[PDB]
Coordinates of C-alpha atoms and ligand atoms in Angstrom, one line a residue:
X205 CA 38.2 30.4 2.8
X206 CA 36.6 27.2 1.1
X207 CA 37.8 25.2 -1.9
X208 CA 35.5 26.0 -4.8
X209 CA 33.5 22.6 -4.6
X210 CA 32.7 23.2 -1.0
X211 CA 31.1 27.1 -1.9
X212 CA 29.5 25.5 -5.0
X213 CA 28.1 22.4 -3.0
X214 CA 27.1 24.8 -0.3
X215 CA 25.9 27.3 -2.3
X216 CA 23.0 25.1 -3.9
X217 CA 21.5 23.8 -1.0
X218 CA 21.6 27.5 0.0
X219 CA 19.7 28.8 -3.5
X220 CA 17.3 25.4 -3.0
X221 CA 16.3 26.1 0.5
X222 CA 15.6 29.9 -0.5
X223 CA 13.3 28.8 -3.1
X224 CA 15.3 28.9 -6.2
X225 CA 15.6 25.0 -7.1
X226 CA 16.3 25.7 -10.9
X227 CA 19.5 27.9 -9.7
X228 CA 20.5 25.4 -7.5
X229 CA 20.4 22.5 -9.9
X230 CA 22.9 25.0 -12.3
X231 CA 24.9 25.4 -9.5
X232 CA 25.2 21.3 -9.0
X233 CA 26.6 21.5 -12.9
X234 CA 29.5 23.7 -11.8
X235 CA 29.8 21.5 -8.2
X236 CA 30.5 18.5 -10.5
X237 CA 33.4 19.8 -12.5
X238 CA 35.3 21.7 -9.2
X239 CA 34.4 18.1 -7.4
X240 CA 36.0 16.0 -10.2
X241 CA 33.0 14.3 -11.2
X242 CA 33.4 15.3 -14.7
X243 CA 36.3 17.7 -16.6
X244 CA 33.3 19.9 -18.5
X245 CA 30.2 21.4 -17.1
X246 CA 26.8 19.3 -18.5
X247 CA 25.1 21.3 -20.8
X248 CA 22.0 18.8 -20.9
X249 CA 19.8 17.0 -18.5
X250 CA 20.8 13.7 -20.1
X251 CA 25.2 14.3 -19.6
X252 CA 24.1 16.3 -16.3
X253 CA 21.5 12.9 -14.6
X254 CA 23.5 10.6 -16.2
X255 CA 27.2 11.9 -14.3
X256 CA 24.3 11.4 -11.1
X257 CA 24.9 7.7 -11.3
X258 CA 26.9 5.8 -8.1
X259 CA 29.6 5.2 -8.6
X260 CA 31.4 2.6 -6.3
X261 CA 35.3 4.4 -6.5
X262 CA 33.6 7.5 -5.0
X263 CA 35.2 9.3 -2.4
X264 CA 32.5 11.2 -0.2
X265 CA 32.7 14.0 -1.4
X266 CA 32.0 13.2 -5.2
X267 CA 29.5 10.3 -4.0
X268 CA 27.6 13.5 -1.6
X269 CA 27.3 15.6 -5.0
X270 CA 25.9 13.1 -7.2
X271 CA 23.4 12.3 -4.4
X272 CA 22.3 15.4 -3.4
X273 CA 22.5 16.8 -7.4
X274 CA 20.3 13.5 -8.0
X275 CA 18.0 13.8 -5.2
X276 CA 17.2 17.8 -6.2
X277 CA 16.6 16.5 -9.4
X278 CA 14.0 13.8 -8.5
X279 CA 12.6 16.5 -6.6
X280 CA 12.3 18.9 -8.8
X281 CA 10.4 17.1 -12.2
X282 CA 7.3 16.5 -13.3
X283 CA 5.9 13.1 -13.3
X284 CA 2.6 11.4 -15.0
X285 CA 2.0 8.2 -14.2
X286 CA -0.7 5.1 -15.3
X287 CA -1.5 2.4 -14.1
X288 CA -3.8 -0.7 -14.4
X289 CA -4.0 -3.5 -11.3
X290 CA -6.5 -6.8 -12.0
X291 CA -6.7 -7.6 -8.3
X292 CA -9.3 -10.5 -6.6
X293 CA -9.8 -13.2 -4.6
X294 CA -11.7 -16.8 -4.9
X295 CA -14.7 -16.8 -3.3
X296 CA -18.7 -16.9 -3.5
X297 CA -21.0 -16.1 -6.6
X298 CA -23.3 -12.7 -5.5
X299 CA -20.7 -11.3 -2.5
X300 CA -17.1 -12.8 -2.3
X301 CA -16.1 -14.3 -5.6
X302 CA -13.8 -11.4 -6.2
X303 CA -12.6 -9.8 -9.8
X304 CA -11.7 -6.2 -9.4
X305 CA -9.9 -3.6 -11.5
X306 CA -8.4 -0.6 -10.8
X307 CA -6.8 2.3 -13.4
X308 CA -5.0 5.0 -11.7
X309 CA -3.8 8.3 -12.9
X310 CA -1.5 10.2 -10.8
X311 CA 0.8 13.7 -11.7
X312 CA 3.6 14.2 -9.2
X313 CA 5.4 17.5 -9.2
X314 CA 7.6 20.1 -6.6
X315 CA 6.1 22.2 -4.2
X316 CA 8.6 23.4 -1.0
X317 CA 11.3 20.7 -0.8
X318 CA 8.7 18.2 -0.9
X319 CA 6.1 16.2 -3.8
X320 CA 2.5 16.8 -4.2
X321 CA 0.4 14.2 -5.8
X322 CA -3.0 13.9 -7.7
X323 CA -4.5 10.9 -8.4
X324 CA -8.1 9.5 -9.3
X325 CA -8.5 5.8 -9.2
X326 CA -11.2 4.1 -11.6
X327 CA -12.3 0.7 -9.6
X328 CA -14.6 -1.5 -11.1
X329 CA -15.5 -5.0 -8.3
X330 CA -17.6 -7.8 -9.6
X331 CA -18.4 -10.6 -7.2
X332 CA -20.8 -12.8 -9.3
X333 CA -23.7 -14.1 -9.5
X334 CA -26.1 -15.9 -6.4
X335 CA -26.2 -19.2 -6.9
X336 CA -30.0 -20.1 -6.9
X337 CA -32.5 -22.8 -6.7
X338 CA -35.2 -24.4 -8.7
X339 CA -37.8 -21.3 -7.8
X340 CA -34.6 -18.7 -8.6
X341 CA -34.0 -17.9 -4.9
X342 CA -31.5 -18.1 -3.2
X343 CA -30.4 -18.3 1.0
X344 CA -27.2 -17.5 1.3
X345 CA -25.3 -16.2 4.6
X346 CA -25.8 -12.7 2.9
X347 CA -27.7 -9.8 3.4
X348 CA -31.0 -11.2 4.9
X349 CA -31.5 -13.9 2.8
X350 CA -31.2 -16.6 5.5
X351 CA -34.2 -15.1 7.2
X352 CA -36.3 -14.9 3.9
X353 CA -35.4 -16.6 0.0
X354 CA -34.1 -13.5 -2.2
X355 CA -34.7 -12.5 -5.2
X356 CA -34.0 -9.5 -7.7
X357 CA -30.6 -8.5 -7.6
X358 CA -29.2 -11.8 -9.1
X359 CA -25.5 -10.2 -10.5
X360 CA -23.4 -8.1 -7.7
X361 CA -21.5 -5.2 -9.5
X362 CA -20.2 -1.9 -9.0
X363 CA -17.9 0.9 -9.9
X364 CA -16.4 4.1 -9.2
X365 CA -14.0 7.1 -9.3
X366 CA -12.3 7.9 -6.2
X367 CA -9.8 11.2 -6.0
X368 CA -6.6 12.3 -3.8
X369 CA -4.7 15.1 -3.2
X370 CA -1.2 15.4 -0.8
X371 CA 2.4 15.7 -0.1
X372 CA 5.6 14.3 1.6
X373 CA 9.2 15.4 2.5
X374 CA 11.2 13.9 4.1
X375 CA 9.9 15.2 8.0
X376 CA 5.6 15.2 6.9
X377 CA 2.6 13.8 4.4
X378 CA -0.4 14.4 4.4
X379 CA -3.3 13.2 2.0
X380 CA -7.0 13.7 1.7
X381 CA -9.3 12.0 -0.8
X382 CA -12.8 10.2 -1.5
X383 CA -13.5 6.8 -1.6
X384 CA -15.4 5.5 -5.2
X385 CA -18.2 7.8 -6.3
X386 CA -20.5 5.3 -7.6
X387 CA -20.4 2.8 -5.0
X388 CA -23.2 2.8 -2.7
X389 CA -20.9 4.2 0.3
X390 CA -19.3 7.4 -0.2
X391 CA -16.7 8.8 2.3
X392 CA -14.0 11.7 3.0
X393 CA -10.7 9.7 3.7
X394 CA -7.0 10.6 4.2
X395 CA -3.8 10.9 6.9
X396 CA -1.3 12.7 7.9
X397 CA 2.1 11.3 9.5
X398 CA 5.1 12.8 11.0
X399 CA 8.8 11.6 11.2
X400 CA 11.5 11.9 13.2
X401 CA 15.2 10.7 14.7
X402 CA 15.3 11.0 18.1
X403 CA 19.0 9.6 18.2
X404 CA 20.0 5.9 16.9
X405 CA 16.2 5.0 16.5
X406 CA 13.6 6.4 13.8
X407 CA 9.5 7.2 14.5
X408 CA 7.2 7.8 12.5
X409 CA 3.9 9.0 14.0
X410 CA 0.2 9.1 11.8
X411 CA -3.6 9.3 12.0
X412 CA -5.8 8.3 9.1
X413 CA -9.0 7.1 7.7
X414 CA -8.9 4.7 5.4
X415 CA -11.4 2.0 3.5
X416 CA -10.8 -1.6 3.7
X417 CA -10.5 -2.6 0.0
X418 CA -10.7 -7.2 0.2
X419 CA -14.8 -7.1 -0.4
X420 CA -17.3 -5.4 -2.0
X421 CA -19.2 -5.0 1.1
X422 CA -16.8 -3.6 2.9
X423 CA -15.2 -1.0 0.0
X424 CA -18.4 -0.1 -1.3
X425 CA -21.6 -1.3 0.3
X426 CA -24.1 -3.5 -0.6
X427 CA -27.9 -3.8 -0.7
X428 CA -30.0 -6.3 0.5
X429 CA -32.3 -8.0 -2.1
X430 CA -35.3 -5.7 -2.8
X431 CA -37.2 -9.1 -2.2
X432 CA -36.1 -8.3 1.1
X433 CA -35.0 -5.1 3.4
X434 CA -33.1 -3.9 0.3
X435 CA -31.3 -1.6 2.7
X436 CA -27.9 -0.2 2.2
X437 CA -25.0 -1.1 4.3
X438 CA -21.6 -1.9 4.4
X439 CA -18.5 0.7 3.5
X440 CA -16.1 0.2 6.5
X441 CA -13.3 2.6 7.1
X442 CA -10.6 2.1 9.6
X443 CA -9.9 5.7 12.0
X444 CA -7.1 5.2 13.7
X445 CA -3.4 6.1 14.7
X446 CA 0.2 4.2 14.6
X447 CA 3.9 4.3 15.9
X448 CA 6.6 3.0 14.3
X449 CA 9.9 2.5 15.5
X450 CA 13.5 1.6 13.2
X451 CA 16.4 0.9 15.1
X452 CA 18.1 0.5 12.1
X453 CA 21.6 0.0 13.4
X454 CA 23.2 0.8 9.7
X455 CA 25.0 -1.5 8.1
X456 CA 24.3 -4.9 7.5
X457 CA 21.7 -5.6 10.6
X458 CA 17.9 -4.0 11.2
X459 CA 14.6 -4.2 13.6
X460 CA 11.8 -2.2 13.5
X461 CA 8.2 -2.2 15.5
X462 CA 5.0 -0.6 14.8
X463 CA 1.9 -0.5 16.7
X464 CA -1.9 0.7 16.0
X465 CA -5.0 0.6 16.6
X466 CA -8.2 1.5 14.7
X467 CA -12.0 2.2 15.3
X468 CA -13.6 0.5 12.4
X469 CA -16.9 1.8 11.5
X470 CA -19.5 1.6 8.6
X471 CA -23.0 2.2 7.2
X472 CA -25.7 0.1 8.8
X473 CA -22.4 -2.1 10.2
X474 CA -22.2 -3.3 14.1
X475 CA -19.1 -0.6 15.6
X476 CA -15.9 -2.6 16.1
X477 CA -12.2 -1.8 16.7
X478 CA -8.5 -3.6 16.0
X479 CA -5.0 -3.2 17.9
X480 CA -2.5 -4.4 15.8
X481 CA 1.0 -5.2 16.5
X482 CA 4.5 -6.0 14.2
X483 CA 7.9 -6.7 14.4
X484 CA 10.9 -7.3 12.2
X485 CA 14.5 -7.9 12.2
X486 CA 16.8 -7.9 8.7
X487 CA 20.1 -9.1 7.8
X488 CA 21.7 -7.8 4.6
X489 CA 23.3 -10.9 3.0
X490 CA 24.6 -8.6 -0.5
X491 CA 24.8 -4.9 0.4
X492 CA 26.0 -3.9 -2.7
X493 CA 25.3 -0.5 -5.0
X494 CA 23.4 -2.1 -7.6
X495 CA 22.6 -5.5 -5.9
X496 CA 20.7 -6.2 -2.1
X497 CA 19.7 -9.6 -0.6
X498 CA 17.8 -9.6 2.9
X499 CA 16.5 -12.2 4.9
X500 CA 14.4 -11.4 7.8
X501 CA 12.2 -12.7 10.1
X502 CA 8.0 -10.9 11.0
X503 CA 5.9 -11.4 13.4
X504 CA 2.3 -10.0 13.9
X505 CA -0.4 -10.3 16.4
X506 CA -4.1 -9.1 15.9
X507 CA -7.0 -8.8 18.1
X508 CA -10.1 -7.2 16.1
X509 CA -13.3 -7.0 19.2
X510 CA -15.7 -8.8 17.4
X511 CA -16.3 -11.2 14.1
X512 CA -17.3 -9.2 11.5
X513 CA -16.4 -11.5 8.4
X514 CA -19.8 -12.5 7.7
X515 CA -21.7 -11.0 5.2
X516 CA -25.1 -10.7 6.8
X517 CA -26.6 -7.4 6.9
X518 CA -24.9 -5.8 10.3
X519 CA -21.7 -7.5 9.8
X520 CA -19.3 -5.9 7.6
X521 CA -17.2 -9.1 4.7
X522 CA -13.9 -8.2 6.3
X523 CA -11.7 -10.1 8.0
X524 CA -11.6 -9.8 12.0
X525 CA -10.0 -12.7 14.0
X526 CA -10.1 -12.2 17.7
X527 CA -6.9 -13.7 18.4
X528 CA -4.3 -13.7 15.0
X529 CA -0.7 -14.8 15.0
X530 CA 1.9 -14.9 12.1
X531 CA 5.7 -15.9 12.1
X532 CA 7.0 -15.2 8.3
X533 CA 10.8 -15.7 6.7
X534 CA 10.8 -13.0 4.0
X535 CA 13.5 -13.3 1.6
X536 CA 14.4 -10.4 -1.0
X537 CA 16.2 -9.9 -4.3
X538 CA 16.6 -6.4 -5.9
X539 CA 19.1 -5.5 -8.6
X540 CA 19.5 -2.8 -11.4
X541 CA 21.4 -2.5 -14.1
X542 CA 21.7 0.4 -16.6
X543 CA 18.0 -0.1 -17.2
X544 CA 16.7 -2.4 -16.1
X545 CA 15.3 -2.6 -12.0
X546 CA 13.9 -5.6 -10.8
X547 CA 12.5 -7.3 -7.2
X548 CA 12.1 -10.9 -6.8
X549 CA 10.9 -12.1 -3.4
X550 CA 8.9 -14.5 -1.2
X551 CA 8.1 -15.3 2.4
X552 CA 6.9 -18.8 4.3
X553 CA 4.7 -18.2 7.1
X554 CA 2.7 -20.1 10.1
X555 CA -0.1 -18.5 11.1
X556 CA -2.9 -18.7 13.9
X557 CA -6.7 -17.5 13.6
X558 CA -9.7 -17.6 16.0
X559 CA -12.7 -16.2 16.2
X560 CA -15.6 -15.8 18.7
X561 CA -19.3 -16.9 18.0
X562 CA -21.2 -14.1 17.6
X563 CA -24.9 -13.2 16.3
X564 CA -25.5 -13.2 12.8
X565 CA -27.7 -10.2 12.8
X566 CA -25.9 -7.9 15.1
X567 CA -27.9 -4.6 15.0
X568 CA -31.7 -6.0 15.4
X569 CA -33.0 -2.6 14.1
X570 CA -32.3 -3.6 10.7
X571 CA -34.4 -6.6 10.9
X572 CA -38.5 -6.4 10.4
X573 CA -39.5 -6.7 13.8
X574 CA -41.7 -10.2 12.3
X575 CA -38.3 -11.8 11.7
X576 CA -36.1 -10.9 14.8
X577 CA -36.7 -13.9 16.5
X578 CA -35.5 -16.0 14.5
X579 CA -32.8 -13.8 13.6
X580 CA -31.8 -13.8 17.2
X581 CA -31.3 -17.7 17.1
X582 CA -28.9 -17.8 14.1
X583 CA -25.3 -17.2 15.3
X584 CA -22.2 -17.7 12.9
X585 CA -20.0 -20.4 14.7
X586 CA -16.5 -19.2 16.5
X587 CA -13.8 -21.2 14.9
X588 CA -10.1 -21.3 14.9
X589 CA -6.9 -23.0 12.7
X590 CA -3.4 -23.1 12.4
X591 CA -1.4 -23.5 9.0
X592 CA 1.4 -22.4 6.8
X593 CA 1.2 -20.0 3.6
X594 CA 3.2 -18.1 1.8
X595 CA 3.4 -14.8 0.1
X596 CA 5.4 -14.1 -3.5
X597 CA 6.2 -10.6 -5.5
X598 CA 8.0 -9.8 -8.3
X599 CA 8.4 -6.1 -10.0
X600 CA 10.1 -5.4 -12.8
X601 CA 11.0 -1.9 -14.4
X602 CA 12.6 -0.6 -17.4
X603 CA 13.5 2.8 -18.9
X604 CA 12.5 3.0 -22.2
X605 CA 13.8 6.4 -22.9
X606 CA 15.1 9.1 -20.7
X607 CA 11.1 10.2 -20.6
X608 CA 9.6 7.2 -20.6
X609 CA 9.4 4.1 -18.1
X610 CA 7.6 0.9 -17.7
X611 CA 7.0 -1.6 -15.2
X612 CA 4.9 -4.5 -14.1
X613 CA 4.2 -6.3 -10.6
X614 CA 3.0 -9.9 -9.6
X615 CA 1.8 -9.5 -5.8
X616 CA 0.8 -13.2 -4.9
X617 CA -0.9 -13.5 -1.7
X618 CA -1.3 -17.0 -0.4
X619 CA -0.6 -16.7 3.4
X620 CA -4.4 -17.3 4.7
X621 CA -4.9 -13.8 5.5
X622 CA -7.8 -13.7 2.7
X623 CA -6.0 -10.6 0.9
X624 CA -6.1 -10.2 -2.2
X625 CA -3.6 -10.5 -5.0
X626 CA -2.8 -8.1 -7.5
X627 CA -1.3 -8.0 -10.8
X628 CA -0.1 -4.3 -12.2
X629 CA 1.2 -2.5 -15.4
X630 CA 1.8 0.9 -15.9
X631 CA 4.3 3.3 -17.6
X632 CA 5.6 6.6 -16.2
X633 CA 6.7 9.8 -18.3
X634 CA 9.3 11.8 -16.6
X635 CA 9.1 15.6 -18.0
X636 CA 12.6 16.6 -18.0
X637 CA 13.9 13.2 -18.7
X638 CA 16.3 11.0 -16.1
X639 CA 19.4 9.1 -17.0
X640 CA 20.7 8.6 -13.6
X641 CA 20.3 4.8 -11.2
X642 CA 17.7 3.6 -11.9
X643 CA 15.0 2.9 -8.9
X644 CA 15.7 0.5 -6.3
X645 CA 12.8 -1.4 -5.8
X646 CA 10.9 -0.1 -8.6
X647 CA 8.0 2.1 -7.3
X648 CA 4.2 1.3 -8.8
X649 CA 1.7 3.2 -7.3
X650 CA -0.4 1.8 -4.8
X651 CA -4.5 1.7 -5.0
X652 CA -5.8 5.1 -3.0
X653 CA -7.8 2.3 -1.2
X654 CA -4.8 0.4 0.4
X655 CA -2.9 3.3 1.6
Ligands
3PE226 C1 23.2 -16.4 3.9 C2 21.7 -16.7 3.7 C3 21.4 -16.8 2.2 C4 19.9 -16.5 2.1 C5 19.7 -16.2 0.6 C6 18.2 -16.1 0.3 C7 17.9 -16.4 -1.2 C8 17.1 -17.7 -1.3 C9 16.8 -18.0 -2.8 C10 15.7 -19.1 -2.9 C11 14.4 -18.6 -2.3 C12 13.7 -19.7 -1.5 C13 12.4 -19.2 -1.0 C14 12.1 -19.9 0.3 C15 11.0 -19.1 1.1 C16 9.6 -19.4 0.5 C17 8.8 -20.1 1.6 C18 7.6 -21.0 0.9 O1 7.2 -20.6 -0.1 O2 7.1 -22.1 1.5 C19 5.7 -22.1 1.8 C20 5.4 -22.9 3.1 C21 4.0 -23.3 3.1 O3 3.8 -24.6 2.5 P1 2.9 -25.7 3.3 O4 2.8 -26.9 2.4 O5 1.5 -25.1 3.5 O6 3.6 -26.1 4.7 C22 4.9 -26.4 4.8 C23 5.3 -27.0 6.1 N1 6.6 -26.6 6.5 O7 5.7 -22.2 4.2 C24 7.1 -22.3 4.7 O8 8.0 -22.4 3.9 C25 7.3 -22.4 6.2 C26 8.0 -21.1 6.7 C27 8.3 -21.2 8.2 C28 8.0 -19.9 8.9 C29 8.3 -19.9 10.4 C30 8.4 -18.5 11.0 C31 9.4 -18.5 12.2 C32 9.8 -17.0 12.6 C33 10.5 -17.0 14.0 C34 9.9 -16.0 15.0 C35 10.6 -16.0 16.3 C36 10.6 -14.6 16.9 C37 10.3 -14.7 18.4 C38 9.1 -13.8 18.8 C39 9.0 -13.6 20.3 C40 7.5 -13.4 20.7 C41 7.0 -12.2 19.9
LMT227 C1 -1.5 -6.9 27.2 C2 -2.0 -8.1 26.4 C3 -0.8 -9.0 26.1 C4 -0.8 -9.4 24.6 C5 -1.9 -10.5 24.4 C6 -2.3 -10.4 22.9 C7 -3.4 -11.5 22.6 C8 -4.7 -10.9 22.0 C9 -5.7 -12.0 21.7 C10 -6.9 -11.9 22.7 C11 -8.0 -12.9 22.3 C12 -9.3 -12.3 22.6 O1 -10.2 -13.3 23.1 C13 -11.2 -12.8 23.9 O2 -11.0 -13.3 25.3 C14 -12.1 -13.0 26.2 C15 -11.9 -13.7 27.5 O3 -10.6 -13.5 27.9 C16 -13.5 -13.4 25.6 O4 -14.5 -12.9 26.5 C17 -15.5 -13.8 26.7 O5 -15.1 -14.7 27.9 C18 -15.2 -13.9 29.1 C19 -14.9 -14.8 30.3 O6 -16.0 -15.7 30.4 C20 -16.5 -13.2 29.3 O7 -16.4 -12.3 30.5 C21 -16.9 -12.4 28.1 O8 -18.2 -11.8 28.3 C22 -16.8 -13.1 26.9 O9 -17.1 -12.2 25.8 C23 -13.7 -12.9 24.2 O10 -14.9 -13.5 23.7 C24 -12.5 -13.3 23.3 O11 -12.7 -12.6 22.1
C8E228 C1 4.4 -3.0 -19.3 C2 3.4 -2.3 -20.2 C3 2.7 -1.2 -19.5 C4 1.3 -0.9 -20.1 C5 0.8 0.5 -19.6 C6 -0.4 0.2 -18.6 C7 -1.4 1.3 -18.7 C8 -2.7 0.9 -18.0 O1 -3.7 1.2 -18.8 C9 -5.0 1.0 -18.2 C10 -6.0 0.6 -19.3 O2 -6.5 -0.7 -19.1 C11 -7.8 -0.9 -19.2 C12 -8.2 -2.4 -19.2 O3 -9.5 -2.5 -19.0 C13 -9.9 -3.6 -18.2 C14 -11.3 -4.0 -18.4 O4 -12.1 -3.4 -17.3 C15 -12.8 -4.4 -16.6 C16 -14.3 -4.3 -17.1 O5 -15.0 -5.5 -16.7
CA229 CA1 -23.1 2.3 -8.6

């Protein structure tokens, strides 16, 4: 026979694997009194999350059921969250002077052992207005406008509503979604990934398609002046696939690769592809319950096939270095007390960039056939530069009552990579209420784009 904790402890997984979760989370109650957690059974979600809480003088079998009673839990309730992130980048009046906001509803809830999700995301991108001359033209390196002066569509705006749908467990997610209706290119998007241990080492396999978010042009599309071709194009999405490997060796030490690769792909934009390499290795300086420090050292390496930063109609405003190098020191913070969970971190970096010459007008079909001669002559210059930058983060989260939670996030991106920076609010209500650990980071949603 068993002692009555082991049946209890056993007997939940066994009622939440058959598909009665709400069983199995009254079954934790009684696995917490015959385990010594507590001397009387929780008759509330508060007593019953709150006994959930680590506890450091645990022996492994009273630390395993206020894990696993605490991760069934989790699993099992109904989440709404919102969220606001004012994101940008500096840049040029009429394509690349970047203010964008994004609100973000999402409802998380059970389904299997897993979470689904639904989200919409409400972006709104201005980039300003052209600069122009004395006859109100202008000729920037944009659209056409360096083979003819433009004119008419002075102010560069647009918004939208994008949508998702998906799931994860631990093993599988998958999501699919839209890109912002409203912007002037519309697409399908989403991925799927698969996880595994195949001994000491962890993989994690995926395919997806997914927008690249740092410019108008390449999020949403443009159109060329109507002085001018006033065609559509832009709206790049990245297909690809990715590997990533974690030989996290336990304890105090880590290292972990990923590769991928992308076809990247747009409307009226020249066809171009990426490979993409990482690394990293971690030390744990403080490994504590309620307290972790890590240094670490990255490194990445880039090759995108062709230059397609420029924002000429046929290239595509996104960033696409031919050869791209970084070396970065990340250093981390995170702590949480009773409620209260915070991040602090930064990371120096050198990096390397070049890129190749290439035309400026890279599909000729899009170019009246009276100005593709000259168009033909105008190249955008390859260039290249070394430097240091840095990046800094810091998310804080606090539970305001056992249903309600609020956080913020500063994501500061300086380390020459032109990505944007964000800054995010937004509060989360919990259904059945949680006063167990807190979360470790805290956990804002991300932007459907940057998935
Ligand atoms: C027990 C330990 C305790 C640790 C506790 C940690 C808590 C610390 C609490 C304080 C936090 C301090 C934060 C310090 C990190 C922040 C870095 C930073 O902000 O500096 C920015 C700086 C850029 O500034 P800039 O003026 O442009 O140039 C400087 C020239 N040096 O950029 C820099 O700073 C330069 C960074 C240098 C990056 C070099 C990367 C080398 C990586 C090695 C890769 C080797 C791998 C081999 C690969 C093989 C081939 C693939
Ligand atoms: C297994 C690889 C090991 C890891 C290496 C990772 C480094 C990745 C960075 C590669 C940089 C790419 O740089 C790329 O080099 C080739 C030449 O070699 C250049 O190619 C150019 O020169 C060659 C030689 O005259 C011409 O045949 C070619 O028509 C021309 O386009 C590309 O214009 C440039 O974009
Ligand atoms: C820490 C406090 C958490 C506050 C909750 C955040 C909820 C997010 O609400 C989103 C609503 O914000 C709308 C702001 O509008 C921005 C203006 O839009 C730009 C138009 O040019
Ligand atoms: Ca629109």
């Amino acid at each position: 026979f068993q002692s009555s904790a082991m049946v209890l402890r056993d007997g939940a997984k066994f009622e939440a694997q058959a598909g009665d979760p709400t069983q199995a989370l009254e079954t934790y109650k009684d696995a917490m009194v015959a385990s010594g957690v507590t001397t009387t059974r929780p008759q509330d979600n508060d007593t019953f999350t709150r006994l959930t809480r680590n506890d450091e003088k645990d022996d492994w079998l009273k630390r395993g059921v206020r894990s696993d009673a605490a991760d069934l839990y989790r699993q099992q309730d109904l989440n709404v969250t919102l969220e606001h992130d004012y994101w940008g980048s500096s840049g040029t009046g009429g394509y690349s002077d970047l203010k964008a906001h994004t609100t973000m509803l999402q409802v998380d809830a059970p389904y299997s052992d897993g979470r689904m999700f639904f989200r919409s995301d409400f972006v709104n991108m201005n980039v300003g207005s052209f600069s122009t001359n004395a006859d109100g033209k202008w000729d920037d390196n944009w659209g056409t406008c360096t083979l003819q002066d433009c004119s008419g569509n002075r102010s560069q705006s647009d918004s939208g509503a994008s949508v998702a749908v998906g799931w994860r467990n631990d093993v599988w997610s998958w999501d699919i979604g839209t890109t912002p209706m409203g912007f002037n290119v519309v697409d399908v998007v989403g991925g799927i990934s698969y996880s595994d241990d195949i001994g000491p080492l962890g993989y994690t396999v995926n395919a997806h398609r997914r927008p690249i978010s740092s410019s108008l042009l390449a999020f949403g599309g443009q159109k060329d002046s109507p002085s001018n071709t006033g065609k559509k194009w832009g709206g790049v999405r990245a297909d690809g696939v990715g590997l990533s490997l974690s030989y996290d060796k336990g304890e105090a030490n880590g290292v972990w690769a990923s590769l991928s690769g992308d076809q990247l792909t747009g409307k009226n934009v020249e066809d171009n592809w990426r490979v993409r390499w990482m690394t990293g290795y971690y030390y744990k300086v403080i490994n504590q319950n309620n307290r972790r420090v890590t240094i670490g050292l990255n490194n990445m390496i880039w090759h995108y096939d062709k230059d397609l930063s420029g924002y000429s109609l046929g290239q595509g405003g996104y960033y696409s270095p031919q050869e791209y190098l970084s070396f970065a020191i990340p250093v981390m913070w995170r702590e949480r007390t009773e409620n209260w969970s915070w991040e602090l971190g930064a990371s120096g970096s050198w990096s390397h960039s070049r890129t190749k010459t290439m035309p400026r007008y890279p599909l000729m079909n899009l170019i009246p056939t009276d100005w593709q001669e000259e168009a033909a002559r105008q190249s955008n210059d390859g260039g290249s530069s070394q430097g240091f930058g840095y990046t800094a983060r810091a998310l804080l989260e606090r539970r305001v009552t056992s249903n309600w939670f609020v956080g913020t996030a500063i994501d500061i991106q300086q380390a020459k990579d032109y990505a944007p920076s964000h800054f995010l609010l937004y509060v989360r209500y919990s259904a059945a209420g949680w006063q167990g650990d807190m979360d470790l980071p805290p956990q804002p949603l991300i932007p459907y784009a940057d998935w």
